[PDB]
Amino acid sequence: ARRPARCYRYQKNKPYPKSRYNRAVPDSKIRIYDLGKKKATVDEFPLCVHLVSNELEQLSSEALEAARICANKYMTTVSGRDAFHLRVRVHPFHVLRINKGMRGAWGKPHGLAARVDIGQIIFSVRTKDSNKDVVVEGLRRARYKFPGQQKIILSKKWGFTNLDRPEYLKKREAGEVKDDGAFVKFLSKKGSLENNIREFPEYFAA
């Protein structure tokens, strides 16, 4: 086996990123952070649900992948692969060391871990509001892969935007929003007037 995760649970050390000083570090177990219908437009999926850390701790790259796979699989079976967009919101940048007497004890790189705070979002899922119960379950299943306490929170915001659901709607009823692939661009009342009128024709027209 690998060393048990209890050995690397808490944030005891300063961040030890991969760097010019710390060259020969192994690859992360988690490579994919975006799953489901990642191409989906902002208007497609209003409901956002979050898995949120309630603990100052470290999560291994192996737990993030295992939790990803669990949550994805469940959501695709019960609702289908295009019913949600799942984003993993933590990247394991902190390298864990392992020694392997106490003369010359500075360790070698062992694996990677993500340092999470209290209140920090670990996973996010956007869906249609029909699909709340499914997403909440898939995130519930993921929780068993991580150490510590996580909470499952229904967001007041529209999808992955930073706008409360009514706010976003008013800005879309006006011409103040335009699609930019998966995300969105907002009209500012600032900058050149000419270039704004190129980018946001439906505003002004009113």
Partner RNA sequence: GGUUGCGGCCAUAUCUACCAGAAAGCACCGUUUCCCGUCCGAUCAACUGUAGUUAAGCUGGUAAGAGCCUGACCGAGUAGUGUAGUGGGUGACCAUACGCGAAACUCAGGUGCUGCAAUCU
Partner RNA sequence: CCGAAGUUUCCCUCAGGAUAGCAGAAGCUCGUAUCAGUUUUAUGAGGUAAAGCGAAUGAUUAGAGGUUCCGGGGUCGAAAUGACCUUGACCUAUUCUCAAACUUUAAAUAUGUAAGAAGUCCUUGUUACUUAAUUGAACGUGGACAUUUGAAUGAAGAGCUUUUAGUGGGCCAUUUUUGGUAAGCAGAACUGGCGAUGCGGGAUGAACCGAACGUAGAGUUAAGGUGCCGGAAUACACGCUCAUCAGACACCACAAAAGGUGUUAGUUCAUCUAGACAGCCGGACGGUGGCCAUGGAAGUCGGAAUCCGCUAAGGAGUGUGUAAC
Partner RNA sequence: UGGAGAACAGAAAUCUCCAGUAGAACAAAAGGGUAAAAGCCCCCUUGAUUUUGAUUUUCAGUGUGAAUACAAACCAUGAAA
Partner RNA sequence: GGCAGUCAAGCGUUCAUAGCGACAUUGCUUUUUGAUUCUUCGAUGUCGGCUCUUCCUAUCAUACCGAAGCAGAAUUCGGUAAGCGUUGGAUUGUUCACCCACUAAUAGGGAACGUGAGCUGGGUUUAGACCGUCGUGAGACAGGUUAGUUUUACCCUACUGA
Positions in the binding site for other proteins (CB under 8 A): 54, 149, 151, 153-154, 156
- 102-118: b or e for each residue (b if 16 or more CB lie within 10 Å)? eeeeeeebbbbbbbbee
Task: Tell the smallest beta-carbon distance from residue 175 to RNA (Å).
Answer: 10
**Binding region for RNA (CB under 7 A) out of 2-10, 45-53, 125-133, 163-171:** 2-10
Q: Which amino acid is at 162?
A: N
Q: Which of 7, 13, 108, 183 binds Mg ion (CB under 5 A)?
A: 13
In this structure, are residues 97 and 51 in contact, taking their beta carbons and an 8 Å threshold? no
14 binds RNA (CB under 7 A): yes
Task: Tell the smallest beta-carbon distance from residue 13 to Mg ion (Å).
Answer: 4
78 vs 134: CA distance, rounded Å = 7
- State which of positions 139-198 bind K ion (CB under 5 A): 143, 146
Q: How far is CA 190 from CA 47, 163, 180, 194, 201, in A?
A: 30, 19, 19, 11, 16
In this structure, are residues 54 and 149 in contact, taking their beta carbons and an 8 Å threshold? yes
User: Can you name the residues that pair with 177 across neighbouring β-strands?
Assistant: 186
* Residue 60 interface partner, choices other proteins, RNA, K ion, none, CB cut-off 5-8 Å depending on type: RNA
Site mask, RNA, residues 165-204, x = CB under 7 A?
---------------xxxxxx-xxxxxxxx-x------x-
Site mask, RNA, residues 117-156, x = CB under 7 A?
-x-xx-------------------x-xxxxxxx-------
Phi, psi for residue 138 in degrees, rounded to 5:
-60, -40
Task: Tell the smallest beta-carbon distance from residue 9 to K ion (Å).
Answer: 12
Closest residue to K ion, judged by C-beta, is 146
46 vs 40: CA distance, rounded Å = 11
**Binding region for Mg ion (CB under 5 A) out of 10-18, 85-93, 135-143, 145-153:** 10-18
Q: How far is CA 134 from CA 39, 125, 130, in A?
A: 20, 11, 9
